[PDB]
Amino acid sequence: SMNPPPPETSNPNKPKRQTNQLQYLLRVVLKTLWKHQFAWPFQQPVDAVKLNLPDYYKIIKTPMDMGTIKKRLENNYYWNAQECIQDFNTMFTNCYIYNKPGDDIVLMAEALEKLFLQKINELPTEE
Ligand SMILES: CC(=O)N1C=CS[C@H](c2cccs2)CC1
Incomplete structure (x- = not known):
């Protein structure tokens, strides 16, 4: 069983902001988890073909990575x-x-x- 399309990362119809809290989520939260020795299984969508998990997307209907x-x-x-x-x-x-x-x-x-x-x-107060 194939992989589904990945979650969207671009939508020009969707209103956007760059807030100090979102900057913290990138600069602190994402960066900290990304560099961890255990990050690698989570750095991309679950590839159910390559990992031979044909039931993964039968069970998981809101994928995220x-x-x-x-x-x-x-x-x-x-x-x-x-x-x-x-x-x-x-x-x-x-x-x-x-x-x-x-x-x-x-x-x-x-x-x-x-x-x-x-x-x-420690999420900062919204400016
Ligand atoms: C992230 C996740 O739930 N997956 C589901 C099954 S297998 C795969 C790994 C197991 C041990 C190292 S990677 C990661 C993808």
């Missing part, structure tokens, strides 16, 4: 920080839904989520 989030941040796709924070939480939740407890990938997501939570605890 840090490659998509990175493009959305660099492209100023978002209106507010909460949209981006939701994308990160979707990515983690999908991993916990699809995979079994204790799997390596779940430990990887948990380590990235710990750092995510630490960083968004």
Whole structure:
């Protein structure tokens, strides 16, 4: 079973902002998770063909990954920080839904989520 089209990262009909909170989500949150040793499974959409996971997109109907989030941040796709924070939480939740407890990938997501939570605890006040 094929891969679906990726989540959109560009939509000229969609109103956009560049807020200090969104700048923090790129410069601090995304950057911190992206450079982590466990980032690599999350740096692009799940490739169900290459990974031989024909049921992945039968189970996961709202896919999200840090490659998509990175493009959305660099492209100023978002209106507010909460949209981006939701994308990160979707990515983690999908991993916990699809995979079994204790799997390596779940430990990887948990380590990235710990750092995510630490960083968004210091999300700056909106200017
Ligand atoms: C991110 C995710 O939920 N995937 C689903 C199944 S397998 C793959 C890996 C397992 C261990 C290292 S990568 C990552 C893609």
